[PDB]
UniProtKB/Swiss-Prot annotation, chain A:
PTM: Autopolysialylated.
Keyword Cell division: no
Annotated metabolic or biological route of this protein: Protein modification; protein glycosylation
Active site: H264
Gene name for this UniProt entry: ST8SIA3
Glycosylation sites (chain numbering): N5, N25, N72, N118
Protein name: Alpha-N-acetylneuraminate alpha-2,8-sialyltransferase ST8SIA3
Organism: Homo sapiens
EC number: 2.4.3.-, 2.4.3.8
Length: 290, 279
């Protein structure tokens, strides 16, 4: 039914690249930051600052981790409840490169969401929420094990979006310096990029207060993927085919009611992505996989 | 009739303390006494809490114990009791050779009562949380910097390994100091796991809390480097000793047992515990 329109997709890539230098904006690099440089936050008051230490700099890549990288079929996996029961895991995993959002869980869910991960996003506040600030031996071990399971994937850490990341960022940095060379995970650390990314989408008449992580990943993926397939983008509380109630996340327990805690216009994002699907720019999966 | 110093009895106390506690060593970790990546535990929290020593933390440690071979005649140890308000003890405190203060307590607006001389002040890392907004803004960073600058060459004695609640803020503090290396004259000191060692002297004096206070820890340190110790601001009650009218807990707003023993030591002439207006 859906048919890829490569030429229209590549036009979109070029338009994105006119506003966002994706390869550079993907991560700060060692030679682009000074020790002691003061960072501000994309989404908080200008008064919040964060000084880049020697140790932080030592974790930056030398070159962009996506410099001269090319993947034919990419999956970008959002976290919608539409994925529960979809059995999309095999198809997702056939992709050359899989992007995941907010360190989402795969363990109990691989039949639906897959096991392949080539990039996952990681707000430093994950450490506060799920790893008790790496205070104890058990917390440190649990975090280490989570990282080891990612193997050589990219861990894409936006430490300069929300000022609430600041104190936990030092804990994350210190963990990684301490464990230097024990993990194969590739660290990537975007700087202040959301002004650039917002400019592309504003011209397409999408101007929320904040773009979602999913659409940010689409944006990055456009530069290095030949063809993008979206899964788990469905910001609604019912299944479009069966009409059954859905939770917000695929990992929510069965029966959880749909709720949004927004700063996002997800339905506005979805509408535009769905238009793009119709134009053949990208494939939005909204049904069980075959 | 007046308190009189009993120098013989104090010299016996100093010797007993030294025979139970290596004060010069316990005073601070040093660069060569820790290894990068060593896991520290906390004296007063469960064993499960750990903090890994970084290159940067190690870089802030002194090479040699800052109190090695130091000897001062008259020391004041100033606790933070409200009993100091209206005491007019500032001049007498400041006449001391060396003044120890507690928890970075303010002096500027209180100098008539508490003095302005400071040679050592302690600093629980949580001070950053409570008074400096975790150094989140330029204004906070500037305010902390200015506070530090006013200490000039005094020791800042930072116990980061007593309470596990110090862990996250300690990295903020370390990063601040590394970022400002060479801009401040303050001398940093970082005691390690010392409370079990300090405790051993005080346990024999039948002082038996779970945790000894900063004030009595300061007395212990002071015994090694002072000829004579005078205490101010030790009065752990919300009420005036003479009048029983409300008194704030701090002049700038376990302990009763510590106070009782310090009072006994005063009576023995080991130390002078001031509880009244100074002349
Ligand atoms: C890059 O991928 C394209 C597209 O592959 C197809 O669509 C994918 C989503 C997935 O379903 C694939 O298995 C499909 O083959 C490749 O183009 C196809 O190449 C095959 C085999 O050579 C050919 O029979 C098809 O006609 C082509 N399909 C289209 C739409 O062109 C392309 O070969 C891939 N290139 C590399 C180097 O991997
Ligand atoms: N029902 C849902 C839930 C999520 N998403 C998409 O999947 C991404 C990842 O979801 P989630 O981890 O829940 O992100 P949020 O917590 O919604 O927040 P943010 O986008 O700010 O990271 C979102 O950015 C959004 O694009 C969606 O389309 N429909
Ligand atoms: N009313 C008071 C207040 C303080 N103190 C003494 O002054 C020291 C410093 O006081 P404070 O800054 O209040 O210490 P705390 O923060 O209460 O806790 P800690 O004693 O653990 O530093 C205390 O250790 C205590 O010995 C006192 O005797 N009477
Ligand atoms: C792929 O998409 C492009 C871009 O929209 C299509 O090219 C357009 O075709 C429409 C419909 O006839 C024309 O009105 C436009 O003028 C064309 N624009 C450009 C820039 O070429 C193209 O038809 C699509 N391909 C397929 C197979 O649908
Ligand atoms: C993100 O990419 C943008 C370009 O889209 C970068 O902005 C450009 O940076 C160079 C400085 O070397 C200037 O020559 C251009 O004028 C800038 N363009 C615009 C539109 O401002 C930006 O530096 C990148 N940011 C990061 C953190 O990588
Ligand atoms: C994307 O990540 C996956 C792992 O999630 C990589 O696939 C693994 O590759 C290793 C090393 O060759 C194999 O031993 C594993 O069996 C593979 N696992 C899975 C789940 O497929 C894959 O190479 C990565 N792709 C890149 C980097 O392009
Ligand atoms: C100074 O303190 C010492 C030590 O406590 C006092 O000497 C003791 O005095 C008592 C009472 O006379 C004797 O029973 C002990 O045998 C003494 N011990 C020693 C080691 O001398 C001394 O009297 C104090 N000086 C005063 C009160 O002026
Ligand atoms: C504080 O001083 C005490 C000695 O009073 C040190 O305790 C000794 O530590 C060594 C090495 O850990 C042990 O082998 C000895 O048995 C200990 N002696 C005693 C009497 O317990 C302690 O290491 C010092 N701690 C710090 C952090 O300086
Ligand atoms: C104890 O600390 C005080 C500072 O609080 C030192 O006194 C200062 O000494 C400097 C340098 O000579 C003078 O410029 C200041 O006027 C003095 N200030 C005060 C308040 O007296 C004092 O030297 C220190 N004592 C020791 C023994 O280190
Ligand atoms: C020490 O202080 C005492 C008490 O005022 C004084 O008598 C003595 O001369 C001082 N100086 C020295 C070097 O002992």
């Amino acid at each position: 039914k859906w048919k890829f329109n490569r030429t229209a997709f590549l036009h979109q890539r070029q338009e994105i690249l006119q506003h966002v230098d994706v390869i550079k904006n993907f991560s700060l690099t060692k030679n682009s930051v000074r020790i002691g440089q003061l960072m501000h936050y994309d989404y908080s008051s200008h008064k919040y600052v964060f000084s880049i230490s020697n140790n932080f700099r030592s974790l930056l890549p030398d070159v962009s981790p996506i410099m001269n990288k090319h993947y034919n079929i990419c999956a970008v996996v959002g976290n919608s409840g539409i994925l529960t029961g979809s059995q999309c895991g095999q198809e997702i995993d056939k992709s050359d490169f899989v992007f995941r959002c907010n360190f989402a869980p795969t363990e109990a869910f691989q039949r639906d969401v897959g096991r392949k991960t080539n990039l996952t996003t990681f707000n430093p506040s994950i450490l506060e929420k799920y790893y008790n600030n790496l205070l104890t031996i058990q917390d440190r071990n649990n975090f280490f094990l989570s990282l080891k399971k990612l193997d050589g994937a990219i861990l894409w850490i936006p430490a300069f979006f929300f000022h609430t990341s600041a104190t936990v960022t030092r804990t994350l940095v210190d963990f990684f310096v301490e464990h230097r060379g024990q993990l194969k995970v590739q660290l990537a650390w975007p700087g202040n990029i959301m002004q650039h990314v917002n400019r592309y989408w504003k011209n397409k008449h999408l101007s929320p207060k904040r773009l979602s992580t999913g659409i940010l990943m689409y944006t990055l993926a456009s530069a290095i993927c030949e063809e993008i397939h979206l899964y788990g983008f469905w910001p609604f509380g019912f299944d479009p085919n069966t009409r059954e109630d859905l939770p917000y996340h695929y990992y929510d327990k069965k029966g959880t009611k749909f709720t949004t805690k927004e700063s996002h216009q997800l339905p506005a994002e979805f509408q535009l992505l769905y238009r793009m699907h119709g134009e053949g720019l990208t494939k939005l999966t909204l049904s069980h996989c075959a």
